Amino acid sequence: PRMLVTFDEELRPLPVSVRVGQAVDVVGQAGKPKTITGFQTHTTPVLLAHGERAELATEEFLP
Amino acid sequence: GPDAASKLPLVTPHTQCRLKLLKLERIKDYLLMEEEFIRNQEQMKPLEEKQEEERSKVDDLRGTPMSVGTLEEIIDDNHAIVSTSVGSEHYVSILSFVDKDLLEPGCSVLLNHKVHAVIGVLMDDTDPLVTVMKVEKAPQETYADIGGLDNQIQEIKESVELPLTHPEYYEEMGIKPPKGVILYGPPGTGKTLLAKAVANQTSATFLRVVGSELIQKYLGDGPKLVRELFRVAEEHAPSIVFIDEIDAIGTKRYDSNSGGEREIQRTMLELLNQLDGFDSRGDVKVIMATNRIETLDPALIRPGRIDRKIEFPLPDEKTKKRIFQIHTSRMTLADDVTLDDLIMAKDDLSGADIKAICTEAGLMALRERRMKVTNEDFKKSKENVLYK
Amino acid sequence: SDTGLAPPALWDLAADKQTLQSEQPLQVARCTKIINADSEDPKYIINVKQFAKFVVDLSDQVAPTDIEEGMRVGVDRNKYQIHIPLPPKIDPTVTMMQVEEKPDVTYSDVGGCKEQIEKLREVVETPLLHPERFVNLGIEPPKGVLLFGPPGTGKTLCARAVANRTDACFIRVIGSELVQKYVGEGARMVRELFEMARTKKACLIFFDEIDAIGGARFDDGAGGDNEVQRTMLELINQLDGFDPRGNIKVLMATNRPDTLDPALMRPGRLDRKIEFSLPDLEGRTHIFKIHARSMSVERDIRFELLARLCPNSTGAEIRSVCTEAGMFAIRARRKIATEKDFLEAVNKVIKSYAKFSATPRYMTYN
Amino acid sequence: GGRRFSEGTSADREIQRTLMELLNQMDGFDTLHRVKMIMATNRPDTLDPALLRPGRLDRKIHIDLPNEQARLDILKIHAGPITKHGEIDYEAIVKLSDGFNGADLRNVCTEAGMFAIRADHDFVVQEDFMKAVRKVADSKKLESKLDYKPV
Amino acid sequence: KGVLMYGPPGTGKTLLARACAAQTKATFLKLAGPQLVQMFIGDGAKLVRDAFALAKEKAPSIIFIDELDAIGTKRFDSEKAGDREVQRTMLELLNQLDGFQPNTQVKVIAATNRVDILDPALLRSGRLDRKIEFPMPNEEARARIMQIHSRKMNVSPDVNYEELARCTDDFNGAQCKAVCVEAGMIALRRGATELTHEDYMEGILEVQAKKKANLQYYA
Amino acid sequence: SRRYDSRTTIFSPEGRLYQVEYAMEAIGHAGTCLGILANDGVLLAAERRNIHKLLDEVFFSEKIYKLNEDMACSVAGITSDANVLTNELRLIAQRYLLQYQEPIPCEQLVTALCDIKQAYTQFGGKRPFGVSLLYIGWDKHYGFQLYQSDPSGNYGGWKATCIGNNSAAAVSMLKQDYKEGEMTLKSALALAIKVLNKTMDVSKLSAEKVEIATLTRENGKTVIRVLKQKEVEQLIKKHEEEEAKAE
């Protein structure tokens, strides 16, 4: 979770997310201002909206 | 606090995208209504001018001989105890005209000269300590000038310079940048050269202190300068603190030290806390340089306080030639001295000796009013420097 | 301008008329200190700062019980009449030691110190919270804890963490601040500290790195350290000294336990001693998890194997491996680490920097 | 007094000045007539070598621990006004008291009464006096018997 | 005149003084150690002359000087710096106690755990006179020492203090109380209302303060 | 007792024998000792550090010792250690002659002494010998030789080297003025005179501060000589005249 930064057109492809910040494994609070995830299309959400009720489903990768 | 400029640095479109236009026009409409909004109400209600009337009344409430004093304590809001000019304490009443925010316990206060009260805070004169270590800009030494050391320049770049220019890297892997760097090697290897090289291409307030000034005269005025050093660094946003010749806090004994070794140790125990204590750290990176890494307490170097230990060896033969070329670049030689012949003068020349040869060579050419150094000058230069 | 110009809208909110209503009716007073309460009915003896010692009684509205000997009180500037009691003076350098912002670390970032954490909560995090449990039995909970171990083991983390959850006021002390120039005022900072704490019903003091002011009594016949020794005695006397210390619960962690006076290490002052030893195999396998969470991993990483490759590795040396293993990925330009990256990390932070280290020369505590 | 440190402290050069004033008014430009001074000290070695110079402190008496003859004389004075009974022997106490400077000898008398007061006795005997001579000697080993003479 | 109390770190020195301040209807001026020490020249003397004038100004008084090391360190000859500011305070204490005035109504009690460092002048007979030795409990004081601090919480009838007083050797009095105090905190861990002998014995180790060392390859 | 033990045979954290390094540092304060190898002989030139109007002239040399009929050595460092090592060298040579009935080759002698030094710097707990020796001699195997030794126990064969005060300057000067395989004894003596002149910054050579020894073969027998005042003065005069002619 972190603030939202817009890169509609920038000289360099800067990452959408500023920093990972907190990544506590245990259950924790989720901030309202969510943004785009990282790269590699890993664990990519399907909802694409973060409405506080998004569900995650595991997939088959590198069998 | 607030920044006068940078009203909205939304340069994300970075082009002729219409999004730039919409926001700009928004303020224009608001400005138009405000114009007649202020002047109109300023006629039928001629109580406060806000430009000449506002300032005028407060000045009368103030006094012509405004006083200067030290705020000693903060009793309940609108009330405070301010130390008078000489030695008296007054239970003055704080006036709302003051910002009521800069009232730090001990900075400064302006008081009326007859009914003493708080009338206004005063910005504190830049303490002489800050000016002492506030290096402005490295005079001439660049980062490609250093030459030689290559695998050792990446560590310093990757600890004290990368996290400030490309934070994303230590932003997506969730790894905090290595805390500090300690440079150790024989006497003269570029330890300080690399130290001032980083000051060149940096955007943070560089502070430098040698290990010798960390040892002071009176007891207690030891691990109190260490507190001041890290208090200035925090106050000045990102900053790289460089401690040079750290091996002078227990390697050299001075009679001025009222307390002996026992006092110097407590300076280290305070420096230990300032690098990793249970207080917050912020953004302050410590670069320590020394020529004897084996003569200091092995807790100041504990991982967490200083993480990356960079080793500076005596120059390699290949690097020796590079050292001569860089130092002799702006010199009108006499196409009779061969650099390669002087590379092997002594078994191990530090590199600072190389500059000494190339600097005494010129002084040996000035004596004859000649603007070209010959093999004779270098031959006598290589003997007057590393022999006696 | 540049002096005190505040929000101009707030000035009118200041009600300049009221300010004039306050810059005349409200008489400015002068601080003083009472020495005696000469009996007869009033007749209080006063001592202004640097004018004289006058004799004053009262004005109308200060109850006689509102005033007591040695109490800060303001006085009139013309007739010298007490008008309002004033707070006692606490040295500003001692009042800055109070922590106002809790450190951002909890009791889940220290790993392997399960027994240490539990034993550090029944003396600093249970007597205060749920204080009725001990009442239904005769128990004065231990008051004081010494945390000792090799450098970079977690002495401060377990202390920085306790301040994150403690409800009572937390007071810092570094052990070098208590060293001051002139004889005397190195015990004032140790007398004022407890006076401030006693003003708080629940208070904790963390005498971090108590080795600069906690040495052993040593008489060389050559006037060895004496100011530090005097300061230590004041600390020793204010924990069990013919005066109930109150609710103050000390917490001091020392890097060199085998240097303390054999009077600061007895029950009553520093009651319970908690040992912070180097993490065991199960431990350092857990420190790796608590420091490699918010980082990209191959998921399938043999963290147990990495734990067993650094047997006597302090907690700090494990974070430097994690913080350095990902460093080897920033250089290769990759974004996801790998086990081979960590193995090269262990080869550099554990076996390549072992020349300096601190563990080998400290586990003897000398 | 003191030895006039070099590299002293802030509030120690001031005490030095006071010594330099008491020092100069002893033997200075105006000789002091018909005013004699007596000084005492338990450590006449820390004194500055200007206060000990002949002319300022001319004679240096050396009051010492009492000898065998003196020790007996000491006991009578402080052991005199005691409700004694029997052949109180002062010769016994003296031999067993070596190094008893000037007060434990009076302590011997006062301590003896303490033993006598126990047992509800308005009755002091020789055994009580002896019983106090050892109790004082035992409490003397923890001192540091040093001479510390001037030089 | 005077009662010096010396001994190992914790044996009961301040307990007797605090106790003697309870069974006595007289002023009990309570001094300290570091406290008579003040930065300014002569400020230490004021607090000693004033601390004895006040006691004399009042009825029979006892003036207790705890932690006498801070103001009674052995005098020390030296050039090139030193410490005589504290020495004057001691020198004013010496003369005030017994010098040029036979004051006989203020009683002085002193507490110390290091008599080797004291100035020989402070251990005369005219000054503090009855130099009491406070020794560690031998084998029975440790039994009463625990019953005193244990008679407030709970005790099963089958709790042999004699064996407890035997397994605890070289224990000063203060450590003995920690045994009883820790006997409860460790009975609270296993939720219960009654202390048992194995709780005391198990808590003896926690107060002994001996690190775990995998002491399991012996025997 | 552990407390009073100086621990003179330990490895420093950087793997350096500190006592050996300090002993070497001691040699830097001794007299200058120089040795040049020629096609027809070897020579040793030494700085007579002791200089006083009251010292008497005794023995055939002050720092140049004779070890065999075909060997000699010069010592720089502590004089007493030099005497001990010279006695040991003589004993070793005589033992070899008794065993084999042939003079000891120089390499064997230097190796034996260096073995003694190494033993002292490895085990025993004693301080190392603070002396460096220059050897010159002839043998039937390699002809004329010039050897060097150090407290550590390291020896190397040299054609021209210097040990003592201002050794680095002497080595540099020799490196520039040494013609390998084309030097007679006269040229070697001239070079030694120049080196001693420049290395002893204190005034100029007075012919009393220099002790020069020569090793040469004549009629099948080795001859070791110590130059007298006359020949040393003649060399000084020739060097001064040559320098004047150059300028």
Ligand SMILES: Nc1ncnc2c1ncn2[C@@H]1O[C@H](COP(=O)(O)OP(=O)(O)OP(=O)(O)O)[C@@H](O)[C@H]1O
């Ligand atoms: N490797 C090098 N490359 C370039 N310049 C060098 C190098 N080593 C030394 N120098 C030169 O040596 C000069 C004088 O020594 P220098 O400031 O470099 O010392 P240092 O290596 O930082 O040592 P120390 O910590 O002992 O002061 C410098 O101006 C620098 O230009």
Ligand SMILES: Nc1ncnc2c1ncn2[C@@H]1O[C@H](COP(=O)(O)OP(=O)(O)OP(=O)(O)O)[C@@H](O)[C@H]1O
């Ligand atoms: N058990 C642990 N779990 C996680 N991190 C730990 C642990 N022990 C130490 N650390 C790490 O140690 C660092 C801080 O060390 P800290 O100052 O607490 O150690 P210390 O040995 O008590 O210090 P010192 O002796 O220098 O005062 C942090 O980066 C923290 O992550």
Ligand SMILES: Nc1ncnc2c1ncn2[C@@H]1O[C@H](COP(=O)(O)OP(=O)(O)O)[C@@H](O)[C@H]1O
């Ligand atoms: N004989 C005893 N009986 C009970 N408690 C004792 C005894 N001796 C010491 N203590 C304990 O020691 C503590 C007082 O320590 P004290 O002896 O005053 O320290 P110091 O000797 O350094 O002044 C008290 O809490 C008391 O419970």
Ligand SMILES: [Mg+2]
């Ligand atoms: Mg440098």
Ligand SMILES: [Mg+2]
């Ligand atoms: Mg710490």
Ligand SMILES: [Mg+2]
């Ligand atoms: Mg304990």
Ligand SMILES: [Mg+2]
């Ligand atoms: Mg005088």
